[model samples]
Target chain A: YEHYISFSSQLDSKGVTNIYVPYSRHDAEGNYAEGGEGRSNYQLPILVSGPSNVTVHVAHDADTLNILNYARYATRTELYYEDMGAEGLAYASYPESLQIKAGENKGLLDLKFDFRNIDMSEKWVLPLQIVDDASYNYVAHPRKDYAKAILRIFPFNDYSGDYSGTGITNKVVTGYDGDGKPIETAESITKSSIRGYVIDEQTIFTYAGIVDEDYTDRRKYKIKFAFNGETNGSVTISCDNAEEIGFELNKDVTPSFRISSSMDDAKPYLEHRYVIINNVDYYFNYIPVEGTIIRYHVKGTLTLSRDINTQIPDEDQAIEW
Target chain B: YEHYISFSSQLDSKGVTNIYVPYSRHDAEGNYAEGGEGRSNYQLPILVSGPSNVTVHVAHDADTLNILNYARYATRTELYYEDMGAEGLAYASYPESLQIKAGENKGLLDLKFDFRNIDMSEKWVLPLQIVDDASYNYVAHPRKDYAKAILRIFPFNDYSGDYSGTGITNKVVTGYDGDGKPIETAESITKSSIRGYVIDEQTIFTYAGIVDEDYTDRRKYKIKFAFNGETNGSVTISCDNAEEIGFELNKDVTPSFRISSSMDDAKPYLEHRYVIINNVDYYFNYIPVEGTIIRYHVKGTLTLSRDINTQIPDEDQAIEW
Candidate 1:
């Protein structure tokens, strides 16, 4: 008997999703210690729907990854990805096949990874698809995305979170106003949450301009940041898609970073830490319509703050998000 | 014909309202600049309900002040008040009488003050009453409180506000518990709002123990604080009625004060300053029924924090409440 099963990644057409995988923290015995929201040892449930008592086969599909990489809206730009390669294969493991038990209408597939030796700078993903084998009676769902899962791997550090983007201004340049200032287009985003993807202890990558991290063409405007110094650090910005997207930093405005701290007024034992990235002025070109180029100038700051319970001994539990 | 009139001080005998009178922050030529929640030049309306078109004579009553000072509940202790005398009379001004306009049922007696030279440390209050003059026709209200208004004057400083009192704990002693510790009375106050009345730039006064600021015996538990250093300082707690209340600090617990600051996480141009008073332990005695004494020990921290916009030039306008 054939069973209809597909990846339960989305309930709607616009539902592509991602999850955070925190870097592993070890105890004195070298075992996984609980910290942050998620960890490397955590197993992300890969869910499926339909029928019972049938076995499902899974395999790595590169062509599916290639098709899924192209932008679905905004602009035709592909998301960047690097091959997991031999090192990734050694660091990550998963069951190639699993059974949908009798009386059950769903299945679960889990992937595990060791992030200790993985490079934090790269955008790594475990591209997967369900396949049909002679040993399994179930067939993969025909809808492309229904059968595929693009596990966009994000490693969170101390600074990674949804930063308040209300401080950052996004404007699309039209012609000049009467005062000789650049006129902004009606379709401009003034505020949006910026997700900082952890690159290392002192660095993160965020989508440049007004592009959302969940946007199809997000990878085209990704900007990398490297913070130097301890408290008041200087941030260096770079972009791999700079040449392709005509991305450039506004030379007149320099980007800066700072770390400030204070104790909780009511609870003196608690402390607060703030990471502020200021004066971020980036100018880039975009093509929303055929042969029509639009210039965008995003200026202002991005910041995140954490409250730490100084009395708590556990490093992970001490930080109150 | 005489019309009866009185102050609308209490509707049901428990309502005694106090209003904030802020310190005058002057502009370029020493004019009152807009700042804080209230200003010294601000007019407070003394309300009274009576027959229409009745003229009411108001006068400064010293004997009424003497009678209102005694505690009505808890222990038999009186509120502390120093005569405003010559200095206060020159600084404050008000109309002697006001009339309930024709077809109107109430009147507003306005009082204005200039807080420029007035000492913030003195507990200053202007006592007034609805009196009778041979010229006008209205009779004074018989209810003592209803005819009186004790305007407790509190000047504002950078650190004055309602501090979070949740971190503070108050307990009354009843010998010992099962663990040989002091047994707390059933009536205990674990959380409350501590009002910091500004005394000067470096000092403020707050009622001690479980006693609320509006409590009848609050004056006996009043604790004055002096903050000594710039960042981390020592706090000195003193009481005017120390001998009568048997007020004493727990020698084992030392008091401390600190001023810490940090920039706003979302807004880099905004800064937060915290004034924290820690390890505050005060022991005092109370007599509800003659010789039946109840002991109280208040031990915890009191704190207030202010948010300031660094970009704003005016000092008072810069603070965000």
Candidate 2:
């Protein structure tokens, strides 16, 4: 209840109209909720200018927020009006179309956002922009402007005292070569994700192969599976390598639970399956059990050599191949 | 000369290079461009891999090459290489020890550009990057790593194959504000330091004051001084309006004959300038003149106001105010 702040315009010493969304224990724009604004969307004022009766278009850029582990209540192109809010459940409801034909916008509704489920640790930037659509491009008083509203979204009911340090412990961090190796592991995780989540065992992530090689060499192979004494681990991939194994892991991936490999010596397999050099057994690779534990059988100053086989990818998920 | 190719690794389809740079041009690992490449800082191959050093760091975020229009022969940092050449003279003219120890950087220098005088009509970007400092940083075996290098500098000679667009027009594209003024102007010179070249006459820039109501109000200040007709006109300034004449003619300045004025409101007048503020003279100012055709006025609704004054900022000259 104390987290809500309404938009209030206050001019500064410079005589410029300054709009602020100062926080208060009570909702100011007064959405008038029964209990509190749990998971509810709220509206923000996006003003207009050019000092004339200018028809300027307005929109939000959600993809920008997406990079920060945030999402859209509406499509970036969606206009902020009746039909839009009704659908996106963006109840920061507006009265009519946002026909900003003069000075500061005088609406309670226009841009609605729900920071309820987003990661609230890092500061987030919600950008509102004025666009030049087919029917609206003739801008003036204040030519196409972008307002980046930066703020932290903290939950009222879900307020956790521990907001600093990444709340992770008891997890061993593991990384891999894009190709064939569990280059290293430590029982500690310090890297971060877009949403500020510590790279632990939470979401499966992959390490770049070329990256692991550099680290392993620098630390004197200290980051290798053999060094960590892990036996075996793998991912279902389709890379291109002949002497060493070239299994494909999603190239566009980043996580920890998933081990993967890309290729160097050859062409990428459109898909993947493996067999012995004799070309008999065809199968997808598998991951070791969690906890950065090695599958044991896949160990050593290891040489992850792919077999010289042409087993069909559909040979079935058979074990003991 | 073949040593130069040591830095020449090949690129495969994904456009990712598998071949890395190890070491030389003429083989001091050098480029024997005439004589002393004895211990030359030669070119090495940059490659791709797990992404680290193999810190022959191949950072190609050319997206960083965004600064533009703006050094040395032999000049990577300087914009020109010839006249800009041989100074920051990159000793890719070095000695033999630059051996490509491992994965990424091996060496070679070509595409050498010292465009000391090129002014791009378009936005130009030259990326600059920092590579692994240790061991070049020992790259990988056949690893291709080229650190992103981006920077910008603009000199004259390398100006333009075409700087023609902003040049001329059968049309004088006059710009206007959302309201009724030009808010600004241009010089078509003999132009006074104050405004544009004084059309056909001289002395165009004007000083403001109290008569301007804004201190600059009475300056009715017509700038056409000697255009087609009226011969001349003037705006009288007074010393009493409690405001400012924020009109800084490029303070510390455009370095020529531009008499200037800037004051908050009541200071004192040491000079007995224009006396007849008796509503009788109908004028409080006069000046030696100049010319140009007339399409007189300003940009905004052109309320360009100044203040009234007893201002004496003879009050200041600067460092030296």
Candidate 3:
């Protein structure tokens, strides 16, 4: 027979859980209308089946994030690590020291996410543990794993998703050709799907052309897409890290949005919407290694689509990927 | 036999409870170091002795605050009402609906105050009641008073206390005197005690001259005192509502701080600190009626003192008013 304190989620399983939150609470500067409309707190419950009050303190434990790095995804090919560390991921644990009051079996353990500081490119996590103190009247669950929580945070926005990258292409700059025009290597990198990272509700950052999100030098090639939110709206393109990357956008090419929506014939309540980002072009300098400077040119169109069931009342559950 | 629900604080009493909170959480603009250092939430616990979970909603009951307004201060002289209304009083009830889960006796009902918007001059209260809904599985206690909570919020800061206003003088404009100077009525109003309202950690607002805090037009005669937190420091004075009130601080009269502290010989750990505000002068246009504009003048010094028992460990309990 055994009796101990443990997280309610831990009682069902012993692994890290990933929760998705909004990229930012506010839509624009001083615009609080859209604030707090999205997911905020990821509640982790703790309980004691006993009849007495039990108070315990919860704290962040970075060791859990580091130690359990390899214990993720079952498929080896899908497994990866991108630790953002403590500073990059912002969160506050409400009621850090919680009491499971007398005659009560459970108490809420809240992890409130601050989305402003998060860099969506990194895999952010807030590892937590049930700590012991001299002032504490009780102890955490004796099972080492039972009292710990590994919260992986995923920041999402309206403009972020997997876009079709088949039409995009990336070329490594070579020496100038006979006509004085810049030449490029014969081989070019291209891919099927490019992931977009959330910048805001109307904007997203996608790796330029064929650069893989996992590439160590991917940060240098991030191209931004800011949509106007209307049908076939204009897209503003730029890079925040331009100083280091020596980024340049082609003035002649105007990147824009193209949205097409239609109702399903069989199911009138279902609507299919396609968001196409057109005329993407970017040129940037890449430093793969310390002593080498490489120039890259990325250009093309990307597309993303989703299905919405209009019959659903709630916006969160209305859309289908 | 009785089976019912009630607030934990109500189980011990039948009426309102006064709790003091800070006026604002931050110390200065862009100063977040002291943002969350002050009191933020007032927890009102609700519980049930039964084994089954009871879910109930807590709502602000303005009617209770209105009906029980006179049931406040026992001393008739201290009984007064300055209703700020719902707009002037800003707050959010965290987890407004709570559940006393099975095998548990209680849950926390939080009233999170937004200090930035509170008008400290008024008697602020967030009256609450246990409301019933179709989804609610349990009902409130049979006794009507047991389900209600009237929370009187008092905002306090380091400089807030009963300040000796004996030195201050208030005069009403009569006409021009013989020397071409403005003349005032022979009768002057002077008070023994004046109350200060917290504006920030380092600033406070007090009624100008002899204007009673209860005066309906007292808002037009408000003066500000901003302390520098140093011995014999200078103070900055101004009025935010100067446009409507035509507030003018006498440039010739430099208001400053004078602090004197001494240790008690009997109890070496105890210290007495006296804070004196010197050389205060202000002139403002007061409208007693729609057709009349009255020019009034206020001048004088105010002081406040407190005893500290360093022997006590916690800072909150160490200070004696």
Candidate 4:
């Protein structure tokens, strides 16, 4: 399939006036003639205005020798309000107008508009016309004798908003209290957010009795989660919740687990507990009881052995529970 | 006859406030004792805010070392908003207030209020009560505590209205008609005005014609208005109407004068015929003119002198008047 796109581009259409009209001469045969006894048609008048970025380019097919000859008599070529009209156009006869050397081909004159007092969103059109002693001709379309394109100017954003952060702090939770109250602490706070995904690791398991601090002690468990290649996700640990050896009721007996590593690098660890209920060992990370949410709950007491007191706490505490 | 007058000034009421408060301290016998802190009385805080030049000089009987010790500390003392309260009693304590460094015998601080942001047309008094610093122990009194004076800052004229002779130029004429009709010409025309005092140079003569040229000539006449003065008043020339001579009227008249040495060195001859009426003539090393309506007018006419054979007559004139 072939597609065609049209772009409607507008050009400046400001008509040049108050220009020094160059004089033209005619022969006795009533034909347009050059180098006659009358005034000579040399240069045309142009008026330009508006913002700084707008520029005017005059293209002519005159050679170097002819251009040099034309420039000799064209004493003033620069655009100035004094030589031009109050609107910047020179009001003079053809003889007094700017001159163009004879036998010149290919000439390009560029004029830039002033941006100081113009509206940034305004659209301006420049009507390129050639003024001679006898008459003025529209350069763009001599037959039509009117301005063609209208140039539209737009302003772009130049200022950047304040780069300073919101100046607010974030909170993070690291440990839990004896009554299951989550404890959040941060050593230092910053303005940037944490990057990358967090991984889980199983390292150690413990019981109700205080365990000795051993460096070689290690435990292992499997970790499962729906990882969609995102920075953050949820993980579930299945374990045994309750076992009935007889008919003794044990209320408020939820399994608890603690994961830890060296203070310098504290990586999370999961501990799976296996329970023998009716002569069968059921291994699980969490057990759901009646009236409990369908989420992973600690089966038995599991403690992770690591240097927790040596590591520097994340001061900004940006991690959410 | 001159009269001699003698005058003596004296302080009328010496409005000084003196209050004595007993200083109590425990004696060696454990009994409450009074009168031991010496003379803790000092000057009062003075707040001067308005249009006027103010200078404060503190006289110290201590040595230079003692005075410098206090002044050095006072340099870094920051004045808080609370320090601006109270009239005579000290309300704010200066724990780190500025103190004079040792070796500085005296301290003088001057502030000038030029009415830039303050009202100057009315009488104002300094609220000396606002500077109640407990460390200064200074007493506050109307005019007796220190020297006080008020001066009115008024506007004054700095330019003389009389116009001094600055030389003149050759007279030329324009706007002439050929065969009772406006002639087609190729010359630049500009309108201007001139202002100065008219002087009777030759006799009790009436003024006839004014100088006409670009600002090239420097021939002018001086006139005195009041007795014993050389120049009297100023005269203004306008270019709205021609032919009507308010002063002297003469045809083919030319004023002989030399151009300013500086102007001659820069540009031997002036090309433009218009004189900037309101602009400063700094090019000729002349004094600047100041006044509400001071201006210069382009007098006489501007005639282009060239060989008649070399002149090109316009065959097809655009406009016929």
Candidate 5:
């Protein structure tokens, strides 16, 4: 029926591009710096190659989005340099006003900072602040639900030396002793830095039992290591004894056996094994050798196999055996 | 660790077979009868061939599972025949109980009746009841929803005749009227016989709107006729009066126009033939004849020709027409 047909218009507008200001770090000399104050600084790497219109806004706090929210009518300020007689020359002066054009993807403006105006040898502190149009409303929201990057400015050459190993890393271990306690150990390492220089660091290792004590007889121990640099060094790590470290030592231990006749004449069997440590039965298939110690060298193959077929021979055949 | 490995197992069984029963209709004379009551009835068809282990379970109120739930404990009963002194010979006594074998796909059995003791001239009702085993506890649930085939039984001699004119043919006329209404008609033929002579029976017909007025607009009608010697006859129908049945017609109109413009002109002149329909302005290049309805067909052709480097007198150069 004609009731099924409907009409609509096709004229709708797409969203437009707006202007925003990105952050940068500064040094004691008022010059932009990278990776300062325990923070990774990002750069506006891709240059605005062609003719571009750029708008800059100042922030009261780096975490707020007030200027960006009302970006449409937000004002911009021009940066300039002024020469003073005795106080030397002052640069980076805030402009009285700015205007942002509509319909442009990129906005850029020239900014100057005169180093002669102030002494570069001394550190200067500039409280973080943002500048934008008075008509714009502020939306106080942080970019990552946390404080913005901390900026530390120190005079050039005031701080030096490698500072890479100042962070912390975590490690997990298993396997313990008959006392039901985790095994802990400490290790030290030495290294030479740039010939005449030398440095040493210590590492702690811990182990605790993972599998049940009844099944420890069939289990084996394994270790995996990761190094930060390709340098030759040695480390010593202490661990629990072989039995306490989850290794099978008894020679006669095997899985429990049960026969099932659900199928035809040929019955199927099930086997379950158990191991004992500290008077606790740990189920397992292979027997563990008590008081045995093993040392690992250049890593290679490690294999263990056991026979499952168990049948009694005829009287005549048994007599021959 | 060995704790990562696991194992499991399961057991399953297969399905079994079923059974069914077959029988023939009987007349009042204790002998096999042809028809019972309807306009043209015949003896019920007998199962000549079928699977041997087919199960026959009589559902109480359509409850198949109930019979299967208790079929295993059913008591088996046998049937036999015996001669009587003066009340005529008593014959054909069926089994009172039945036992179904496990895993069998069917149950072989037959039922017999004496029409002499019952009224065969009129319709008689006979309902069958059966029970099944409940050991496996697996049976189809009785469907609460179902449709039964209502069968009509009549004397065979009622269908002996030359029933050609009985409208038993399959041909029919169908179309829609000016108002978009659809209509259809048909005829069915049947056979009849009186004293061993064949006769034709007038056809019966039925008519209804193809589309229920409340739900749709299309309507249809049909007729049935019965003739001698033929089990089924031809049928005729018509279905084109869809418009008369409340269906609306869709019209596609094409309007063409011409535009003329002079060199360097900002605006062009358009000549059009405008017609008003339902308070809306419709424009076209050619004026359509009054009362000429629009059809779906459309054809359009355009040609343009011009002469270059042509000079003309001022008076003649003036554009006209």
Candidate 6:
């Protein structure tokens, strides 16, 4: 059985290691490459789809210099199926392989593969081993390891990408109110959604720029978010509803926007216009529920507009007017 | 100008229901801008400032109605003073008057007068009277038979963001540390070096970042330190800190910031030096602790800089580690 299984042909153009493509893609030589993304024949790039976890190529050491100069990039996954008895290359019953594509019959979700968080020095594995997957356990001989692939990711740079900074964030606020009343509250979906996700050298510079000035004294609070929160997304307010507040796609991120609070003596209403900065929403007809005008800003973008409607669903409220 | 045609008082101060006394102030002249135009800057802070100056509004509701038709006229109230009352004469030389109105004695038509000398030091009191001869010898009492307005200025002991329970609440990040361990707060931070008092358990530190996921999320915490003056730096990252920081703190009024990841990570130093987010002064020291280096990430525009340098200041309240 071991001799019958042939995976040796999975080698790369370098003839060193094998590579895996989630879709039907082409090889560098312009051949109809089989596994990656079955798009055009533009080769070389192993079209990696979703599956956050990927395999890694071992780091090399020139000092030792004794190991094989073998290098490969591939993906591995196992599958189980009921055999209808294969007569040579003829299988009476063969369920199609579990294919996951951004747009497809068996593709997972349409979210593009996010390589933004990968470590350049990591050997992330992509072994999807399926033994008796609880849902697939009712067989006699659960022939496993049928469909398999291995992805060896060599050290390389990834193109800057983006993701929607959309989602409900629970911001906990534990303190006294304007009237000096104690409180404990969390935020709801109240801002824009989608943001840019850049992983280029520029991002590295933004964080680790380490300018000539080594030490600069800061105020007592907020040194943390200021550094790591380099995104254009919401630190104060975020977009929880994508359909209602989707951001325009950007080179890097699809940042949902924030809402600024109005000062106490400010006008009863607030209106913020957009400039070159896209990816924001203009909240209107907003009203706070459990929170007061002081804690109102955290209702996210609503309070900033001053068009806040103290009642949550302004539609069903009993209007005095 | 002083003795023009002062309109006769129309109603008694106690007779009106829509009498509103709005207030604002100078944030920095000698004292914090407690009650000026922008005094409405920090509603919570102004609430805490105790001594609040309210502008009395005496509108002409009865105008064109069947009652008093005497409309507004040109009038400006003044703090006419010359030390009096050694005797019961109350010596009518001057009084803390709210005479600012539309016209001479037309103080009857929604007259506008700002009570600027409401001393919080003593039990402040305002007497309601339509003086300047609105009804001087007009009819029965030989004085304007009009509505008089009086306000009670009690020693409120109100406070502002200048010294309120409200403070900074940092974002959080989880996933990996330099040494590679699931961690919360910094592994090793020195105090004063990482100075910020925990008021009511709010974490006000140098910096912090948060992942879409969470190991530790910060609360809207409180830290103490009072600064009654100005800063040439224009207040850097002050929104992130809560200790003695800004001029007339507007409170959580307009925090101009608005995170996630199970794989969300953070750096060790905040990303600002002299930038003030709202009223906060975010000063940064690029140089990290001996073993620390700065790491930064770009979320949306609301970048959450999570490089937190948390160290309990070495026993002594002053000096370095």
Top TM-score: which candidate number? 3
lDDT value, residue B35 of candidate 3: 40
True-structure lDDT of candidate 5:
0.22
Q: Give all candidate RMSDs, comma-separated.
A: 25.7, 32.5, 25.2, 43.8, 43.7, 34.5
Residue-level lDDT tens digits of model 1 in A32-105: 55432233543433333222356666777665444444423213434345444234365456687766565443
- DockQ score, prediction 1: 0.01
List, residue by residue over A1-321, the lDDT tens digit for candidate 3: 011111111122345666555554443352443345333554578866556678878876664553354233211222334443354343444566887888887888865655654455565566677887668777778665677777666666666677887877777778788897768877667777888877766778887655554454555667788998656788998888887877888789688888888899999999887788888878787654456556777787888866779888544346775
Candidate 3 segments exceeding 4 Å error: A1-321, B1-17, B24-39, B43-57, B69-90, B97-110, B130-147, B181-187, B229-232, B241-246, B259-273, B291-294, B306-312, B317-321
Residue B225 of model 3 has an lDDT of 82
DockQ of each: 0.01, 0.01, 0.00, 0.00, 0.01, 0.01
Candidate 5 structure quality by residue, lDDT tens digits, B1-321? 100000000000111111111122334343434333222212222121222333434321211121221121111101100111112422122343433555554444433333223211111222223433565233433321121111211112222211222211221125557886433234311212111111112121111211111111111211111222222222121213323222222124322223232332332332222111111111111101224221111112111211111233221122221
Candidate 2 residues B208-318, lDDT tens each?
211111121233333221121222232222223212321212122112111223432111111211111111111122222334323222111011112222222211111
Residue-by-residue lDDT tens digits, candidate 3, B217-241: 6766667788976567888878888
Determine which window of 10 residues in candidate 1 chain B has minimal summed lDDT. Answer: B1-10
Model 2 segments more than 4 A misplaced: A1-37, A47-56, A60-110, A113-127, A133-162, A166-321, B1-321
Docking class of 6: incorrect
What's the lDDT for all of these models? 0.62, 0.24, 0.64, 0.22, 0.22, 0.23
Q: In terms of TM-score, how similar is model 2 to the real structure?
A: 0.23
> lDDT per residue, candidate 6, A96-144, as tens digits?
2233334322322111222333332222222222222344412212332
Which ranking of candidates, highest TM-score first?
3, 1, 2, 6, 5, 4
What are the runs in model 1 whose C-alpha is more than 4 Å off?
A1-153, A175-188, A265-270, A310-312, B1-321
Report the CA-based lDDT of candidate 1 relative to the real structure: 0.62
Query: Ten consecutive residues with minimal summed lDDT in candidate 3 chain B?
Result: B5-14
Of candidates 4 and 3, the better by TM-score: 3
> Any runs in candidate 5 off by more than 4 Å, and if so which?
A1-321, B1-57, B62-104, B108-224, B228-321
The total of clashing pairs for model 5 equals: 130
lDDT of 4 by residue, A1-321 (tens): 233233332121322222111123234363534443222232222222111221223322122212322233234322111211124422212221222222211122223322222221111222232322222221221221221211121111101011111222323335579997545445323332111111211111121111111111111122211222222222122212223111112233322222222211111111111211111111222212445321111122212121211112221111111
TM-score of each: 0.37, 0.23, 0.39, 0.14, 0.15, 0.16
The 10 consecutive residues of candidate 4 chain A with the worst lDDT sum are A154-163
Local distance difference test, candidate 6: 0.23
